[PDB]
Design a protein around this motif. Sequence first.
Motif, PDB file in Angstrom:
ATOM      1  N   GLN A  80     -19.573 -11.540  57.605  1.00 24.26           N
ATOM      2  CA  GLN A  80     -19.179 -10.197  58.046  1.00 24.26           C
ATOM      3  C   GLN A  80     -20.313  -9.160  57.919  1.00 24.26           C
ATOM      4  O   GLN A  80     -20.375  -8.202  58.707  1.00 24.26           O
ATOM      5  N   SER A  81     -21.214  -9.380  56.954  1.00 24.21           N
ATOM      6  CA  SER A  81     -22.296  -8.444  56.616  1.00 24.21           C
ATOM      7  C   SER A  81     -23.061  -7.890  57.818  1.00 24.21           C
ATOM      8  O   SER A  81     -23.032  -6.685  58.086  1.00 24.21           O
ATOM      9  N   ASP A  82     -23.772  -8.764  58.520  1.00 23.33           N
ATOM     10  CA  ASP A  82     -24.637  -8.323  59.604  1.00 23.33           C
ATOM     11  C   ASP A  82     -23.836  -8.186  60.897  1.00 23.33           C
ATOM     12  O   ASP A  82     -24.269  -7.536  61.852  1.00 23.33           O
ATOM     13  N   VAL A  83     -22.640  -8.771  60.894  1.00 22.75           N
ATOM     14  CA  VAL A  83     -21.700  -8.640  62.009  1.00 22.75           C
ATOM     15  C   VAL A  83     -21.254  -7.189  62.208  1.00 22.75           C
ATOM     16  O   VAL A  83     -21.282  -6.691  63.334  1.00 22.75           O
ATOM     17  N   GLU A  84     -20.838  -6.524  61.128  1.00 24.21           N
ATOM     18  CA  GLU A  84     -20.464  -5.105  61.203  1.00 24.21           C
ATOM     19  C   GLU A  84     -21.541  -4.284  61.912  1.00 24.21           C
ATOM     20  O   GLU A  84     -21.270  -3.528  62.850  1.00 24.21           O
ATOM     21  N   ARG A  85     -22.772  -4.457  61.439  1.00 25.12           N
ATOM     22  CA  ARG A  85     -23.919  -3.688  61.897  1.00 25.12           C
ATOM     23  C   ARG A  85     -24.245  -3.984  63.365  1.00 25.12           C
ATOM     24  O   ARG A  85     -24.549  -3.071  64.139  1.00 25.12           O
ATOM     25  N   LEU A  86     -24.186  -5.261  63.742  1.00 23.62           N
ATOM     26  CA  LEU A  86     -24.608  -5.678  65.081  1.00 23.62           C
ATOM     27  C   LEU A  86     -23.531  -5.586  66.161  1.00 23.62           C
ATOM     28  O   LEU A  86     -23.840  -5.628  67.354  1.00 23.62           O
ATOM     29  N   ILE A  87     -22.272  -5.463  65.758  1.00 23.07           N
ATOM     30  CA  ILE A  87     -21.186  -5.478  66.732  1.00 23.07           C
ATOM     31  C   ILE A  87     -21.074  -4.114  67.420  1.00 23.07           C
ATOM     32  O   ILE A  87     -20.682  -4.023  68.582  1.00 23.07           O
ATOM     33  N   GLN A  88     -21.461  -3.065  66.701  1.00 25.46           N
ATOM     34  CA  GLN A  88     -21.380  -1.698  67.202  1.00 25.46           C
ATOM     35  C   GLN A  88     -22.388  -1.445  68.317  1.00 25.46           C
ATOM     36  O   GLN A  88     -22.142  -0.653  69.233  1.00 25.46           O
ATOM     37  N   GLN A  89     -23.527  -2.124  68.238  1.00 22.07           N
ATOM     38  CA  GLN A  89     -24.579  -1.978  69.237  1.00 22.07           C
ATOM     39  C   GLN A  89     -24.104  -2.445  70.609  1.00 22.07           C
ATOM     40  O   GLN A  89     -24.247  -1.731  71.601  1.00 22.07           O
ATOM     41  N   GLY A  90     -23.538  -3.646  70.656  1.00 23.09           N
ATOM     42  CA  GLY A  90     -23.044  -4.207  71.899  1.00 23.09           C
ATOM     43  C   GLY A  90     -23.465  -5.650  72.094  1.00 23.09           C
ATOM     44  O   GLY A  90     -23.193  -6.253  73.131  1.00 23.09           O
ATOM     45  N   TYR A  91     -24.133  -6.206  71.087  1.00 21.70           N
ATOM     46  CA  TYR A  91     -24.596  -7.587  71.145  1.00 21.70           C
ATOM     47  C   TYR A  91     -23.437  -8.565  70.982  1.00 21.70           C
ATOM     48  O   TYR A  91     -23.207  -9.419  71.837  1.00 21.70           O
ATOM     49  N   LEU A  92     -22.754  -8.486  69.849  1.00 21.36           N
ATOM     50  CA  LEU A  92     -21.662  -9.408  69.571  1.00 21.36           C
ATOM     51  C   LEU A  92     -20.416  -9.088  70.367  1.00 21.36           C
ATOM     52  O   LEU A  92     -20.231  -7.948  70.794  1.00 21.36           O
ATOM     53  N   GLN A  93     -19.579 -10.102  70.586  1.00 21.29           N
ATOM     54  CA  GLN A  93     -18.356  -9.907  71.359  1.00 21.29           C
ATOM     55  C   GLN A  93     -16.995 -10.327  70.782  1.00 21.29           C
ATOM     56  O   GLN A  93     -16.029  -9.560  70.823  1.00 21.29           O
ATOM     57  N   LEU A  94     -16.906 -11.548  70.271  1.00 24.97           N
ATOM     58  CA  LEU A  94     -15.640 -12.030  69.734  1.00 24.97           C
ATOM     59  C   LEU A  94     -15.716 -12.149  68.217  1.00 24.97           C
ATOM     60  O   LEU A  94     -16.586 -12.834  67.674  1.00 24.97           O
ATOM     61  N   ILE A  95     -14.790 -11.482  67.538  1.00 17.32           N
ATOM     62  CA  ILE A  95     -14.741 -11.503  66.086  1.00 17.32           C
ATOM     63  C   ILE A  95     -13.755 -12.561  65.609  1.00 17.32           C
ATOM     64  O   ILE A  95     -12.567 -12.284  65.449  1.00 17.32           O
TER      65      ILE A  95
END
Lengths: 181, 553, 221, 104
Positions: free
Chosen positions: D89-104
């Motif tokens: 979850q650590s780097d997911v929080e940070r990177l999901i807001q940008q627009g890179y990640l998609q499915l949690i």
Amino acid sequence: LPAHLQQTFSPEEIQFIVENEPIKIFPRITWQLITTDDKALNNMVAMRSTEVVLWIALLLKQQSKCSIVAPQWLTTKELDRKIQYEKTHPDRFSELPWNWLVLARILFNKAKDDFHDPIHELRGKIQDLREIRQIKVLKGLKYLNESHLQLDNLSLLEINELRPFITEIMDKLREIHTASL
Amino acid sequence: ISQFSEAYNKILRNSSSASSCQLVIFVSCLNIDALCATKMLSLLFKKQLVQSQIVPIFGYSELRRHYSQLDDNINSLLLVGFGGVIDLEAFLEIDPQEQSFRRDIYVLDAHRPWNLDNIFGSQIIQCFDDGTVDDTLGEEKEAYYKLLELNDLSKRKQRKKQIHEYEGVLEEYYSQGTTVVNSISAQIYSLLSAIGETNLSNLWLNILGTTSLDIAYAQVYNRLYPLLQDEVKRLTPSSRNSVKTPDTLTLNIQPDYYLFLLRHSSLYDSFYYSNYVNAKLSLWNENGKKRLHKMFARMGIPLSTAQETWLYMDHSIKRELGIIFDKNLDRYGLQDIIRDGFVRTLGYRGSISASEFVEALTALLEVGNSAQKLTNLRKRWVSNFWLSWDALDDRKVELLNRGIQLAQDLQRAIFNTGVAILEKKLIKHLRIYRLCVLQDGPDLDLYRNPLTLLRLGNTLIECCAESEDKQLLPMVLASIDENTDTYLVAGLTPRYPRGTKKPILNNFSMAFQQITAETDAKVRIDNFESSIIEIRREDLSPFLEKLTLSGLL
Amino acid sequence: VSPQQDFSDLMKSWKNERCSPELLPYPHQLMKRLLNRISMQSQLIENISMGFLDMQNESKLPLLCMETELERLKFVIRSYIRCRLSKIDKFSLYLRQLNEDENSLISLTDLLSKDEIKYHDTHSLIWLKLVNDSILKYMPEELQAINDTEGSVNMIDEPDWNKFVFIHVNGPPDGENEFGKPCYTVTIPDLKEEVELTIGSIYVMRYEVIRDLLRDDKVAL
Amino acid sequence: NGLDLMSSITFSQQDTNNLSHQEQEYLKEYCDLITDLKSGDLVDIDLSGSLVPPSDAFIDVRVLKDAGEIQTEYGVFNLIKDSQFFVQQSDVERLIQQGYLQLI
């Protein structure tokens, strides 16, 4: 700026809360760790029950390194006395673990294979006890007055779903009436 | 060349760390077996919560773009279905770093023979050769310990004569057809049972894996049934139903059919599009189409009841589905239809035949989605891979059906066009082997994917030969739409009518490399498989002439 | 003084905060010993995580446990203060009028955090500075001051003490306030006669009648 | 904001120049105002993110046409279109807001 919701809790947040409740476990394992708020434990003995907080039981269940115990109040033979006691007191909401909805969602996702007769039974039971109780809330909600309500024993989730509604139209209702004297 | 459990403990020790981890398991490529393997693999990792990267590689040339670009902290690598043929030690290079080498690339492959440079001279592997071909395989064994490191004039002449003596028999090896021994999935399960996980959906992943390839041979699979059926016997949801019950509710044995989409499509359309039955009954012919209806006249199944979807057919016909076929099919020579198959029931949703599920995933892979255009297309396939990856999950069934509404349509394409060929008798018998090319056709967009031409090529090599005397002869196909005359040409293997004496070892792999080494005219091995290559219309004709001679078979 | 108790009080504070219509005292005595404690364990886990690699030519579990825990409790307070700053954003004016007046307790170092006070004054400042070059130029002479006219009003609002809040009654019995039949507490609404209050049952009412019960933590929200 | 490593306020807020500059001065002054709150803790925050609680605590992120690899913090996640990372979850929080990640 919390944005959503914001005045009511989020459905997730009440699980975030309830997971702070401890429940017994059956560890397969035989560091330290002090953590902060746990206080437990001396190395857990396999085939020995012990009391720990929930989120860790769930955590160690994903790795299937521990088998959670079923709550004594979560059973179909147990629930039967509860709906029996609920049909027969249309006014009061009886006796609730207060988490029972959210534990009923959580312990069924993973732990399901640990329960004795979990299948197609208890879910049928609690989806029911979460029916007549809900309509009993909507028919107990006609008696609304300021300022009092007895919501007696009522789940945290049930509180959270209807909260904006009640504590809003109470704030339109009591608002004219306080102000008209 | 190692114990599976011990290779596992190795990939354990180099794995978990701060920061985690790092390993990239390469799922490759377009073969459903890959999914089947790497999904139970990935679930196994999630069990110990080991971080992973997972890459959808299409092109064999594409792998170089990845491995050469991004690697930093990754001490333990895993790869699937690649390297059994061409060695990556020379292809990647490596360049030994730091004995007790820091990075271990596991290579899982069903393809044979292994590259010579792979198994012996341990650097990047840690080979997966175990246990299928161990063997010996004394031919690769003498290939090195002799070769390396290798009155005096007669001893020099003797030595050199010995060197060529080993080089000849060695030349026999590694020049050969590429043929899958056992499904990589099966072995991952053999690795999995030693660790002690019996999980049901896992096992279903195995069933999926094995049944990925039954469209093409078995070959050993005919004897894989013990190794599956016993496992199905090693577990059971309940001793007796107890209908359904809504949970577990699992897979079971049923008289399944090579018949196509029996449960999710209408029966008549299920014969009419089925692949094995296309052949024996001559269904491309209008005169043979009737013979089907005669089948139904024999079964007493109404034509109108054949047109109706299988969910809704009457119950009597269902209970008689295992009898009537025995009473009738025997007479048409169609007696090989009934397999002992595996069917997993999700209960109130429906049931799904092991094979049909695979038809759903294949369906997903091509649809339901100058170098810039091919890269962008292969990219679209890469994205589409995950759309197909998701359907494996139990919790989302809603899109799995989006596969099946496609799997029907594809056949409705494939069959159609397939018939469009036999009307013009486009088959060139030639002399040494059979060959074909599609110069024109509808909707070549569907035919872009390698696997689409694997299935069309399959129904066609199945159609031309019942058998059908004489001489099963491998088939060739070609198609073009866009990307400026890419004219994709896939190699194929002959189909025996359930009586299979030899594996027969597809020779196009060698015959193509002989031409890449000759004039190499617009020849591109870019696709991961040795059987399938690309060509240009300018150079395809001289290529076809150089294909005709010299024939290696 | 125990960690578990500081946590139970943290949760208690968090709920009481998101429930109530208005701001609550800033609990520094605890929140600071937790802001030291987490600075300790976040360093400790990175230290043990780094020392772990030395025995490496085992079990990531207490580390994963620990880390997840720290994510949870570092979420909790972050919700807390991210909420309070919002209520400061809504009450900035009211608080200002509360500060200029002598009685009773102004912001000080207590009612707001030493960190929060900055947020308050700076936000207030840049807000007034925004509206100043935006719509007051062009400045009405009576409307120079931001405060009551009165009417309507403005803000003033919203120290609203009558708003409804779900409340669950809990606290140690002596057998203080228990008048029977079941138990504590009074109640005595101004408009109505007492119910009064029963302890095993949640009773929704105004925030004002219960504010003293809230102070004592004799009823959870 | 935006979020790791904020690291500057840019490309955000599609309104951009269309919205009044009088508000934008307030705005930049306001995120400058919140940088100090970021600088008091020391918690750490990490406050801009994680409005929704972690579970549990590892997730799966599926790449969404992002390049990549820009994951410098903690580790080089090596962003690659059509690639899912079994990351905490650590780097997911940070990177999901940008627009890179998609499915949690």
